[PDB]
Amino acid sequence: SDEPIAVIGLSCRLPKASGPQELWQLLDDGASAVTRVPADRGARWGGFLDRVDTFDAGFFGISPREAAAMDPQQRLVLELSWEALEGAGLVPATLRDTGLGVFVGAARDDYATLYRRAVDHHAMTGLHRSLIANRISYALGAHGPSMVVDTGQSSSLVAVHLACESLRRGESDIALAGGVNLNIAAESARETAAFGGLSPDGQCFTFDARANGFVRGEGGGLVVLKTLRRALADGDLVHGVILASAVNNDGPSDTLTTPSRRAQESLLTRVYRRAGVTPTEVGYVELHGTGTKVGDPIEAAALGAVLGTGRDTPLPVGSIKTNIGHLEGAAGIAGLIKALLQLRRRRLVPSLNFSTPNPDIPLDALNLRVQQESAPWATPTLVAGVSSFGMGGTNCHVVVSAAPSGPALLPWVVSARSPQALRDQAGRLAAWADSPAGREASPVDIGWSLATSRTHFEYRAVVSGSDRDELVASLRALASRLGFLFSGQGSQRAGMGRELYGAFPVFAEAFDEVCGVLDALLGALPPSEGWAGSLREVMFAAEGTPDSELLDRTGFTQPALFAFEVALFRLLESWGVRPDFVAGHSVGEIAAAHVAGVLSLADACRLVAARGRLMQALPAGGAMVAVEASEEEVAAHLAGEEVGIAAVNGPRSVVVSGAEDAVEEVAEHFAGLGRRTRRLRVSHAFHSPLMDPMLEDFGRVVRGLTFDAPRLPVVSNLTGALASADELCTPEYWVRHVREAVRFADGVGWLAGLGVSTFVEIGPGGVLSALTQECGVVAAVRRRAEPVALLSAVGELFADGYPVDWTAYFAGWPAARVELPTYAFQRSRHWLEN
C-alpha cells in the first residue's frame, strides 16, 4: 500500500539506559528503572535520568550562558541527534545543505515553568518548544521540514508517522523522528496528581489486577529514517522496516479523556490493511499499556477484536512503561525503540508488574498473552505493532518488521573535540573492542568503520597493528602547507621499497611502471658490464649480496632513488596526501621536477639513467667530506688556496667535493679547529670540478628532452629559491645542477617564507629531515618495516589536521559497516541561577 521506510539508526536516553545496549540489558534482565525522586530533584516515584542538568555545550559550540537558559530537552535532543546519526554510520557534516527533516514530539515545558517562577535574551530561544526540533536543523545545517508536534501522550509516535509521510512524498530524503519528555518542575507533578491518573504504588500494572494508574518516566529517543529503496541502494544497516503507520482520533468518546474501543479498532484495521499484514503474521504488540482501570481493558478489547480473532496462537503483548514509567510525550518512541531492539535481537523480553490478569480483560476470549520472560522469537519475517494514545484522543499505531583480505597493517583512527574527550573515546573503543560485541567484528571492519563512518574531530590519534589485542593495547595506552623534500644519494639502502611493494599495490604498480622504463635504459647501456637485469631485484636484494652491492654504483643508485620516490609520491596521492611545494637534494630534484610536471616519466628516466651512467664512467680519486662550518668560512678558506662546495646544508653544515687529497687538506683544517667532519661513502666527487668531463655529454642528453612549466611550485637548490617556469625549462639548468652547489638550507628558508609549516622527506630514511630541523619535520619512511614507518608519518600529518583519505587505505576490502560506540560527551552542569 505505502512505500516501506527503513530505520537505519536510533538513540535513547531513558531511566537506567543511557543508550540502546544498556536499554537491552535493562529489558533483557526483566529489571525496573522506576525509583524514588532523587536528591537533586504516587508522585514520589518515577523513572529518572541520572542527571538532567549536565550537557557538553562545548561540543555543540554553545556558550555556558546560552546553555544555562536552554531547556534541558533541547540539550538532550542535540545529543540524541548526534548519537542517532553516528549509530546510522552517517558523518553529520555530509548532511549540511541536504533535505534532512526533523520531527519531534514534545508536550511539556518544565524548564520554562522553573524560569517564570533578571530577564536575558538567551531565554526566548532557550524556552521556546519549537527550537527542540529547529535547533537540530540549525546545528546540522538541514533544509528539510523541522517541527514539534503535540498530541499529548501519542506525540513522539505521531512525529514518526509525519516523518514517514515526508519521506514517502520526497519532501525529506532522510529524517530524525521521536520525542522527549523531562520531568523537571514540581508544578507538572501536582497537575497530574490532581487529575488523579497516578498509581499510588508507583507502578504501571499493565493488564494486571492491581492496575491503579501510571508512574511517570522521563527521557527521549530518535530513529533515523530513509525509504527502504534509498537505504538498500546506499548500503545502510537496516534495523527495522516501517510497513505502515496511522493516526486517528477517538471522536465521540464517553468523556474528553476516555479512550474509544471503536476508534482503536478502526485504527488497527486500517493500518494492518495498508501494511498488507494479517493477524497471524503479527508476532508482538508494544501496548500504550499505562495500567489504568479504564484504559487497560479498552486497549485489550480492541486488539482482541482485530488481531486476536484471526489467530490460533495467543498474541504476546507488553509495555516498556512497566520498566521505565510513562514518558508521556516521548512514550511512543520508547515503545518503537523496544520493538526495534526485539526485532534485531530476534528475542521478546518480559513485561513487568504482571501476575494476575485484570478481571475486565478476558485474555483467553481475546487471544492475547502478557510476555513474562525473555525468549527467542521466530516466524509465526518477524512483525511487531506499536500503539501510542493521547488523553485528547489522538491515537497512533506503527507496524514494524525485521530487516529483509585487506591491509596487513591496520590503522584504527580515533578523534574527539578535546584531549579529555579523546582519552574517553579511546577508553570506550578499547572496552567495546574487547567485548563479545566488539569480538564479533573484523579488526579490518572496525578500521574501515572508524575511517568512513565517524567525524575526524580536532584531536586525533592513529593506532596501528596486526590484530585486535595489539590495537586495543595501543588504545588503552592512549587513554592514559606541506613541503615535500625528495632525498639524494646517501639515502639509498639495501631492500629500499621492498616492504611498501609487498604492502601497497598502488606503490607496486607505480614502481613496476618506473622500473620498466628504467630497465630498458639500463639494459641498453648498463652501468655494470653484462647487466640486463631488473632494477627492482637490485633494490630489493638482501644487504651484502652481489645485486645489493650494485645498488651503491651511482649508475643504479640515481635511478633507484627516482623509482622509490615516484612510487611513494603516487602511493601518498592515493591516500589524499599531496604537497603544496616540492624541492629535492641533487637527484631528488629530478623526482620533484617530474611530479611537478616539468618532465614526463620517459624524459625523467632518460635524464637520471644518463646522469648516473655518465658519472659512473668518471675515474676513481673523487671525495666528499661534510664539514661543521658556514659557507662563508669554507669559501674564505678555499679562496686562499681541484675542490669546491658541493652543498650548503645549514648555516654551519657544508660538503666539500673534489680530488681526494685536496678534500683531505680542507678536512684536516676544520678537524684541526675541532669541528666535526665526516667522509661521505661516495664513488665520485659530486657537484665539483671532477664533474667537468661529463658536462658536454650530459648537456647533449638534456637537449633531447621536453620541459613544461611546473603545475606545483618547485624550489631550486641551484638558486636556493622558488624556480621561475623558465628556470627548470632550459637544458643548461640541469647541466649547472650536476656541477654547482646544492643550496639546500636556502631552499628550506625559501619554503618557510612561502608558509610551509610541515616538511616531509620522500625517500628511504631521514637524512634530509635531520638537515631541515638543523635548519614540523616528518620523514615519510624511517628498526621498523617501511609500512609502519609510513603509517606513523601519515598518522602525524592527520593529527596536525591534514585530511588523509583513510577510506582509500582500505581500497579493495569487502567492508562491512560495524556499530561503534557514539561520541564520549564531556558533560558539565548548566542550570538557571534560581
Please say which residue, 91 or 124, places its beta carbon nearer to its own copies: 124
In terms of Cβ atoms closer than 10 Å to its own Cβ (0-12, 13-18, 19+), residue 418 is: middle
**Which among its own copies, Na ion, none contacts residue 783 (Cβ within 5 to 8 A by kind)?**
none
In terms of Cβ atoms closer than 10 Å to its own Cβ (0-12, 13-18, 19+), residue 120 is: exposed
Q: Which residue has the cell 553529520?
A: 92
Please say which residue, 166 or 367, places its beta carbon nearer to its own copies: 166
Compute the least distance from the CB of residue 253 to Na ion, in Å.
Answer: 3
Contact pick of 35, 248, 253, 574 for Na ion (by CB under 5 A)? 253
Q: Distance between CA atoms of 644 and 663, rounded to whole angstroms? A: 8
Contact pick of 81, 134, 292, 616 for its own copies (by CB under 8 A)? 134
Of 156, 211, 197, residue with least CA distance to 327:
156
The DSSP-derived string for 166-220 is HHHTTS-SEEEEEEEE----HHHHHHHHHHT-B-TTS---TTBTT---B-BB-EE
Q: Does 81 bind its own copies (CB under 8 A)?
A: no
Part in contact with Na ion (CB under 5 A); list of ranges 13-21, 251-259, 274-282, 725-733: 251-259
Q: Cα angle vertex 507, ends 595, 579, to 5°?
A: 35
Site string for its own copies, 750-789 (x = CB under 8 A): ----------------------------------------
Q: Does 550 bind its own copies (CB under 8 A)?
A: no
How many residues in the chain? 834
Please say which residue, 253 or 418, places its beta carbon nearer to Na ion: 253
- 420 in active site: no
Q: Which three cell numbers stand for residue 317?
A: 503483548
Contact pick of 357, 392, 495, 502 for its own copies (by CB under 8 A)? 392
* Strand pairing class (54-55; 828-829): antiparallel
Q: Does 574 bind Na ion (CB under 5 A)?
A: no
Please say which residue, 105 or 407, places its beta carbon nearer to its own copies: 105
Backbone angles phi, psi at 159, to 5 degrees: -50, -45
Please say which residue, 61 or 544, places its beta carbon nearer to its own copies: 61
DSSP 8-state code for residue 714:
B
**Which among its own copies, Na ion, none contacts residue 732 (Cβ within 5 to 8 A by kind)?**
none
Please say which residue, 113 or 724, places its beta carbon nearer to its own copies: 113
Residues 6+ apart with CB under 8 A from 196: 213
Q: Which residue has the cell 560527551?
A: 825
Part in contact with its own copies (CB under 8 A); list of ranges 155-163, 441-449, 469-477, 598-606: 155-163
Q: Does 473 bind its own copies (CB under 8 A)?
A: no
Please say which residue, 212 or 257, places its beta carbon nearer to its own copies: 257
Q: Does 158 bind its own copies (CB under 8 A)?
A: yes
Compute the least distance from the CB of residue 300 to its own copies, in Å.
Answer: 21
The answer to whether residues 224 and 84 touch, using CB atoms and an 8 Å cutoff, is yes
Please say which residue, 131 or 583, places its beta carbon nearer to its own copies: 131
Q: Does 124 bind its own copies (CB under 8 A)?
A: yes
Compute the least distance from the CB of residue 135 to Na ion, in Å.
Answer: 11
Q: Does 393 bind Na ion (CB under 5 A)?
A: yes
Q: Which residue has the cell 530537552?
A: 73
**Residue 592 C-alpha from the chain's centroid:** 33
Of 416, 471, 409, residue with least CA distance to 799:
416
The answer to whether residues 512 and 786 touch, using CB atoms and an 8 Å cutoff, is no
Q: Distance between CA atoms of 596 and 709, rounded to whole angstroms? A: 9
Q: Distance between CA atoms of 769 and 761, rounded to whole angstroms? A: 6
3-state SS track over 741-760: CECHHHHHHHHHHCCCCEEE
Contact pick of 390, 407, 438, 650 for its own copies (by CB under 8 A)? 390
Please say which residue, 91 or 124, places its beta carbon nearer to Na ion: 124
Of 586, 533, 583, residue with least CA distance to 561:
586
Instruction: Using CB under 5 A, count the residues that bind Na ion.
Output: 3
Q: Which residue has the cell 637544458?
A: 731
Part in contact with its own copies (CB under 8 A); list of ranges 241-249, 518-526, 695-703, 720-728: 241-249
Q: Does 150 bind Na ion (CB under 5 A)?
A: no
Q: Does 353 bind its own copies (CB under 8 A)?
A: no
Q: Does 273 bind its own copies (CB under 8 A)?
A: no
Q: Does 238 bind its own copies (CB under 8 A)?
A: no
The answer to whether residues 471 and 748 touch, using CB atoms and an 8 Å cutoff, is no
Contact pick of 35, 113, 528, 600 for its own copies (by CB under 8 A)? 113
Compute the least distance from the CB of residue 143 to Na ion, in Å.
Answer: 11
Q: Does 248 bind its own copies (CB under 8 A)?
A: yes
Tell me the one-letter amino acid at 17: A
Q: Does 321 bind its own copies (CB under 8 A)?
A: no
Part in contact with its own copies (CB under 8 A); list of ranges 125-133, 346-354, 626-634, 736-744: 125-133
Q: Does 249 bind Na ion (CB under 5 A)?
A: no
Part in contact with its own copies (CB under 8 A); list of ranges 6-14, 139-147, 432-440, 660-668: 139-147
Q: Does 250 bind Na ion (CB under 5 A)?
A: yes
DSSP helix/strand/coil, 492: coil
**Which among Na ion, its own copies, none contacts residue 328 (Cβ within 5 to 8 A by kind)?**
none
Q: Distance between CA atoms of 78 and 66, rounded to whole angstroms? A: 14
Backbone angles phi, psi at 609, to 5 degrees: -50, -50
Q: Does 378 bind its own copies (CB under 8 A)?
A: no
Helix axes 786-799, 554-574, angle to 10 degrees: 50
Q: Does 142 bind its own copies (CB under 8 A)?
A: yes
Contact pick of 57, 149, 614, 728 for its own copies (by CB under 8 A)? 149
**Which among Na ion, its own copies, none contacts residue 130 (Cβ within 5 to 8 A by kind)?**
its own copies
Of 1, 9, 139, 24, residue with least CA distance to 70:
139
Part in contact with its own copies (CB under 8 A); list of ranges 94-102, 407-415, 417-425, 763-771: 94-102
The answer to whether residues 733 and 718 touch, using CB atoms and an 8 Å cutoff, is yes
Compute the least distance from the CB of residue 179 to its own copies, in Å.
Answer: 12
Instruction: Using CB under 8 A, count the residues that bind its own copies.
Output: 68
Q: Does 93 bind its own copies (CB under 8 A)?
A: no
Backbone angles phi, psi at 416, to 5 degrees: -170, 175
From 153, 203, 264, 489, the catalytic residue? 153
Q: Distance between CA atoms of 447 and 551, rounded to whole angstroms? A: 37
The answer to whether residues 592 and 744 touch, using CB atoms and an 8 Å cutoff, is no
Q: Distance between CA atoms of 395 and 161, rounded to whole angstroms? A: 11
Q: Distance between CA atoms of 369 and 371, rounded to whole angstroms? A: 6
Compute the least distance from the CB of residue 760 to its own copies, in Å.
Answer: 34
Q: Does 620 bind its own copies (CB under 8 A)?
A: no
Terminal Cα-to-Cα distance of the chain (whole angstroms): 54
Please say which residue, 4 or 213, places its beta carbon nearer to Na ion: 213
Q: Name the residues that contact Na ion, by CB under 5 A.
A: 250, 253, 393
Name the residues annotated as catalytic: 153
Q: Name the residues that contact its own copies, by CB under 8 A.
A: 96-97, 102, 106-107, 109, 113, 116-117, 119-121, 123-125, 127-131, 133-135, 137-138, 140-152, 155, 158, 162, 165, 169, 171, 187, 190-192, 194-196, 246-253, 256-257, 263, 266, 390-394
